[PDB]
């Protein structure tokens, strides 16, 4: 049950951290990328890494060489990882130890994709059979729905899937079905309802037929406020057509473990797909929460998605730190965040199907590492998780890359592309152009354009500063073969273990989220006040004034 | 033609800036919001502002009182605006002076929505008649398309609109049609194609019929690389069905002024909708670029959208700085950015239809103010535009508000809601819950939760730090009546003039974008290399290694 004291308290107390500060002061802050490339023709070989995807038998190239790194920098960052016990915490997580120390819970999303059925246990009880049982249930169900064997209450094939859930019950399913759309069933329409704002469920239902719509109600407790309200509104709409509550069981399933609330809702207990307490929402697309993915692309493709993550898990678990890809990604984030003062982290996929990949990573990263209390209960003496943001390129280029190239912020940036398109329009011309931007953007950010080059091209002398690009703006480039299910699984797992590495160095809990509870408590209180004539004055003057303005504009007593 | 020397060089040289630094050092950095509210029951009255929308006869409440502001702070920020000549530059912009000093161009998006036909001129020639001529053309065309008078080459009514364009030719149309969807034609499907990635045009065309699809090709020059390629791919698909190039003229129109390239493409010159050089892309949805909006919601609603922006223009132009709403928003951004070190700016609409509003603002803000050269040609001695980001709430709450509440960054935040929903599902329950989160999130971020409150609620003593909320996290709350076309127009114009105010104080050009050109030049070069056997070695070692890896994975010599 109880375990050891943490290995350290504050990251700033580790000797390697102090060495990194001295390294920054003397050298790191003076790194000029184009000078290092001029002087070291082997720089790309030194700081690139290749990951083999054994599922689709391809390779993903991770190029870190346009980052603020020397061989000495890398040595010190790996030293910091060792002093912070990154490998020990990682091994604890894979053993099923309760490394989520504020909730006394294991952290076992890695067990969800344990496709080789390696021994995995929590509390000295294997989890493998239970994980596999749910997956088999998911397989059977998706086969039934996709084949048309599962029929609506009037005997029709299901053609609309409507997922209802918040946060991690929504963002993964959205992003993965969008990313893997070429694998999706041609006759299937998916809606993802998540906001409590009634516009969301309304637009989803407006263009759906109760006779051919299947609802997935995603909530471990089946008492999540927003999801319960959306789920109830969906049921009301359904019954307005189906009338008999017995038909619910053909049109609603539950991604949940609260069998009492599920059956009370009207769902047959045989149609709950459970996921464990040690599955965090932002780490849950691999679990029953992925059922909408398996419905859309088929179970075999979902399993390949799992297996790609598993190949990345193996890389993370077995690779020495110097060559360990997610570990280097995490250490770079610490380096930029805590020694260069970068408050943000850009991720830009040169891939339109991945348009919701940055929003997914934003929850993974910021909800994990937006923390300030160490394992020892102290307030951190250094900044933790960045604001993670992005849009797909080339759209992002035409929106905000102006600031990336000529603004006054250091913005560590990850660019991601597949070498092959699922839609090679016009003899590959679109894809060659996409590729040219992927390659040129990192080049441009690194080399810039000197005032001398600018003037050489004929610029008015007094516009030269406006057209100068300082360069020396770092990037990481990730080149996959093709975005298949397994390659996507490996890419997500990269960012999961990057996020793990950050939190291990910072000595924070990447796996709780106590920071969401105050808003929920205060919202429920205010909701009762909105429902209560004359109430709403027990707040600060701003909240009271807004609440009153709202009551007046919305016609509430 | 030529005008005066700028009023100042570096913002840091203004006396009011120095006073703000002294104010920060002595007082501003010690502001604790909950203490100021405890001591000043009139704080909400002092620092809130009300904007009347005369188009839909409603009021929008702007509450700035949960910001790091005292009466003295406000006095000094307004003083800084006066020393930086914010009103003078604003008046110059409305006069049509060439305030875009690096391109010698006026900045006249305000003329696009000059619905009262006030006198407006550039270079001593009125622009009003030309603006109105295009709008009348837009009106006629949209009436023809929506009524079915405009028919495809087989005589069918147009049911699919496909907009093709990049950056400002895409983001506004997307965000506005999404935001105003309740006003959209029930039988109309819109696709917005922007990425050069062929997946974008492919998915749009997959589910479209050439006989009922109308293309809007949005590009001033009609030689924009990405847009031209997408437009050509669209035409190829069209002709594969229509065969006769003469049918192009019934299915392609141009938002452009290059009549030679447009007709060469096959578009009838009578179907170009022009917009002026003094319309910036990120300020262009008000122009011909808004044609997809007018098609979807009708011209009268588009004109109301214009008129709401016009009401905000009037407020910006006529209101003394102390009560001027966009000016206060801009000054707060400078205050947080340059004196508190905040690198980011969150905008979270509590409104799912506005889900693409943050991405629109991200271009408006970052492409405008991601700049480092003053009007006098010097490199700024202070940070300029933030990274602007966000997602709609409540989704955002479940994604990254953990970091907002308990992370280690100062994140100035704007929350936006309408008091009324277009979709008041379940007797307003969804909307009362949405409202409760809008109100509670700003409350929670301000008041936090002390260790004493935490322990009072029964938390384990050694979890108290993990469940503590420090509070004192500032927000701005914007409460509209309902998101109508005019209210949305006023909200965008708020952010346009906020962005104006920032750049005026920083002494940068909010209206150029020289920072996009290096990526374009280097991409075209690399594109030729990809098309050339044996070429691609003339780069730094990283770009060369990536280019080679790409050629190998993509089967290029
Ligand atoms: Cl080196
Ligand atoms: Cl800190
Ligand atoms: Cl005050
Ligand atoms: Cl700077
Ligand atoms: Na900037
Ligand atoms: Na650059
Ligand atoms: Na010139
Ligand atoms: Na695969
Ligand atoms: Na943080
Ligand atoms: Na808080
Ligand atoms: Na306990
Ligand atoms: Na209106």
Numbering used by the authors:
A (entry chain A), B (entry chain A): -3 to 553
The authors write:
AfPGI was also crystallized in the same condition without Glc6P, and the apo structure of AfPGI was solved by molecular replacement using the AfPGI-Glc6P complex structure as the search model and refined to 1.56 Å with an Rwork/Rfree value of 15.7/18.3. However, we unexpectedly observed that a citrate molecule (buffer component) binds to the gateway of the active site and is also recognized by the phosphate-binding loop in the apo AfPGI structure. The phosphate-binding loop adopts an “open” conformation compared to the structure of AfPGI-Glc6P complex and therefore places the citrate molecule proximal (5 Å) to Ala221, suggesting that the gateway between the active site and Ala221 is ligandable. Compounds bound to the gateway are potential starting points to explore specific fungal inhibitors. The intrinsic flexibility of lysine implies that the Lys520 sidechain is likely to move away from the gap, in agreement with the fact that there is no electron density around the Lys520 sidechain in the structure of apo AfPGI. This intrinsic mobility of Lys520 could leave an empty gap between Ala221 and Gln523.
